């Protein structure tokens, strides 16, 4: 009856493992062992940003690398000016229980979402001089954990109903639904060519989806706990995940296996955010131990420590120019570092 | 600094003033989370004061209550329960007519209570415990393995309170406020008032260094 299914599944998963072990001719560390190390990155705070009265759960930079949007629990989406510490906009949210916010590449819209199961799209560059609610996207059963913009009319959302979604903004309808995860999906990252995207979930799994045909192109399984953060390499061929098991792991798409791990014995707390530098050499990860760590992505070394928050670091962001790193935490402050 | 930069800074100062004025108003409010079950009576309690998250606001004796219910979440609790780390109190609804009704209602109630009362986020947060179906326990009869007590009224509910208070580990820092619900009168919210008052003093003493 159902005997054939489990046997066939474990057999072809075992041959997937056999092919993966055959393609592991060496490791990243052996090739990168003759690189001069980066050293110590003593990046210091340049701006501190006050005005949030509750804890910050998300931020996202701009393409222009000067504006940034931040979401807090006080029902506030604040659009800042990094250079002058000027509040460009303050958007009151209909629901204060938000975990994600996004900034469109065109600079015309921002996105927000959280426990209300609705992705809200707000319009900035409009008449009447005020930010207005342009779109409400509903159809997810779980909370909205991450959202990223493709274009002014396409968005991608990750939710805690084991699914991802691709929405058309103008019609407000589910263009594509990405299914296959077993646990709740926490993070999301689009490739630079906007054709593929990786998504990390609570089944200790990352999944590479193709946007066009809506098919799970790849599945990577190395972690032991819930994956909370995921980020693409600037190349678009590799990606990096952070989980609750106090480890970051770097995977390749073409090699279809894990490349590197980033861990230390004195860190036992999870990872809330992950990001890369402009060249991808420096992997910045926000931890629960009130600090952000800066690993060398090729050598698995703790290159630097950003220690300026007296609460849980919740969100990270690196500019498209690569000039600065903004860090937001649970102590109602977010800081620019360079 | 240019003229338009000066005007932008002035707008930023106005936004700071508006943010402070909103922060004071959100600081005078009180946030409580309903965390019982759909088979417990969460919806009946909120409606007796007069899909997605639901959040109700009502003011009782110069105290605005922000009552949040998260019963429509079919996801892992550990990934969003940290969003309620600094709530004032937890309201937990339990149906007394659940041992002989739909399967494992009482076991689910005690399991959820042991999950929440012993949670790392709610280590000092007091729990307001409502026991529903007060008029239905008197007609339902425990008769269903370790009771060893008689099967009349005015003691089974005491046994249920003892069972729920026995799950309270790490005492001398938090208090369980138990109350049989009366669906006719307003004594539900008064108790919610009084318990919250007992929270604020218990906070205020710490804020004045006396405790």
């Amino acid at each position, epitope marked *: 009856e159902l005997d054939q299914l489990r046997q066939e599944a474990e057999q072809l998963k075992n041959q997937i493992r056999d092919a993966r072990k055959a393609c592991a001719d060496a490791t990243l560390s052996q090739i990168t062992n003759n690189i001069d190390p980066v050293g110590r990155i003593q990046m210091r705070t340049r701006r501190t940003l006050r005005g949030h009265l509750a804890k910050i759960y998300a931020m996202h930079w701009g393409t222009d690398s*000067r*504006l940034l949007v931040s979401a807090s629990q006080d029902g506030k989406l604040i659009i800042w*000016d990094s250079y002058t510490t*000027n509040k*460009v*906009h303050a958007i009151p949210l209909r629901s204060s229980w938000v975990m994600t916010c996004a900034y469109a590449p065109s*600079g015309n819209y921002v996105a927000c979402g959280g426990l209300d199961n609705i992705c809200s799209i707000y319009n900035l560059k409009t*008449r*009447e*001089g*005020n930010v207005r609610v342009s779109r409400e996207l509903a159809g997810h059963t779980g909370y909205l954990s991450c959202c990223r913009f493709l274009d002014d009319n396409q968005i991608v959302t990750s939710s805690g109903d084991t699914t991802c979604a691709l929405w058309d903004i103008e019609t407000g309808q589910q263009t594509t639904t990405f299914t296959g995860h077993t646990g709740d999906v926490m993070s999301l990252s689009l490739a630079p060519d906007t054709r593929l995207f990786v998504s990390g979930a609570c089944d200790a799994s990352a999944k590479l989806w193709d946007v066009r045909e809506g098919m799970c192109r790849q599945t990577f399984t190395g972690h032991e706990s819930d994956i909370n953060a995921i980020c693409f390499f600037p190349n678009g061929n590799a990606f990096a995940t952070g989980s609750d098991d106090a480890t970051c792991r770097l995977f390749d798409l073409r090699a279809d296996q894990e490349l590197m791990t980033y861990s230390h014995d004195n860190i036992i707390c999870g990872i809330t955010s992950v990001s890369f530098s402009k060249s991808g050499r420096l992997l910045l990860a926000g931890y629960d131990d009130f600090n952000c760590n800066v690993w060398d992505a090729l050598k698995a070394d703790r290159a630097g420590v950003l220690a300026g928050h007296d609460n849980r670091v919740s969100c990270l962001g690196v500019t498209d120019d690569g000039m600065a790193v903004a860090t937001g935490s649970w102590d109602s402050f977010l800081k620019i570092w360079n | 600094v*240019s*003229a*338009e*930069d*000066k*005007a*932008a800074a*002035e*707008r930023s100062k*106005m936004i700071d003033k508006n943010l402070r004025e909103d922060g004071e108003k959100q600081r005078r409010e009180i946030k409580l989370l309903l965390l019982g079950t759909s088979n417990s009576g969460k919806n009946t309690i909120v409606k007796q004061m007069k899909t997605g998250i639901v959040e109700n606001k009502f003011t009782f004796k110069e105290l605005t209550f922000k009552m949040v219910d998260v019963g429509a979440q079919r996801s892992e609790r550990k990934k969003w329960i940290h969003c309620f780390e600094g709530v004032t109190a937890i309201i937990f609804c339990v149906e007394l007519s659940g041992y002989d009704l739909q399967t494992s209602r009482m076991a689910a109630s005690l399991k959820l209570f042991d999950s929440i009362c012993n949670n790392k986020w709610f280590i000092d947060t007091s729990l307001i415990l409502f026991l529903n179906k007060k008029d239905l326990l008197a007609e339902k009869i425990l008769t269903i393995p370790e009771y060893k007590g008689q099967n009349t009224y005015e003691e089974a509910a005491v046994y249920i309170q003892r069972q729920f208070e026995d799950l309270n580990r790490n005492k001398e820092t938090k208090e369980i406020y138990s109350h049989f619900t009366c669906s006719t009168d307003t004594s539900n919210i008064q108790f919610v008032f009084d318990a919250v008052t007992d929270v604020i003093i218990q906070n205020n003493l710490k804020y004045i260094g006396l405790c």
Partner: single-chain antibody
Amino acid sequence: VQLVESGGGLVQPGGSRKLSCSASGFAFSSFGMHWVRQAPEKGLEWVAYISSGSGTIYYADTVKGRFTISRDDPKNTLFLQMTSLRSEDTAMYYCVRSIYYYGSSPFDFWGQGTTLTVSSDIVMTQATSSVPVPGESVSISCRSSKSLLHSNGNTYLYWFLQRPGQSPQLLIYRMSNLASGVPDRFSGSGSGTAFTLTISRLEAEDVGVYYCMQHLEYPLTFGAGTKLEL
């Protein structure tokens, strides 16, 4: 978006007059507000400015001590008191909304003005006053007295077009950026003290007077204007 200005009329010299402007269709309290007048056969002239929240109030040198600018945001109205009116105050007054943040477009909307018949600064020089023009390309030059390039890399020049019988409308803000509702055939380019506006493939609704305005420091100064004719 509507800015309807009333109160103007004929007044004998040595009097007082109350101009008003009702604002609708936009969030009035978020905008700084400006009064700019134009003499009957001459160019534009900045008069007064009030900030959002009535925090900053600025006047021109020829109206200080006798002009007052105020606002009420619940009533969505802007007010200008004038006292001891001279014969040099005979002008049409325009009420202008302007907002200031990063990437904003100030002086974007101009009201329908009202008439009043009373009977160190940077110099913007627009030397040409009549350029005949069709489907051709035209260029309009403006010049400065001091450089308009601030230390933040932002060149503080604005270009307005006044069609015949119509209030001026914003073409170019900050010397290069093209405003909303404006065709892409307009281009603004300039360096320190020297600026130009290029219109490729001139068509209808291009006839008018073109004004260059600086915004480094109050008082804001216009050029004389350049007229394009068929």
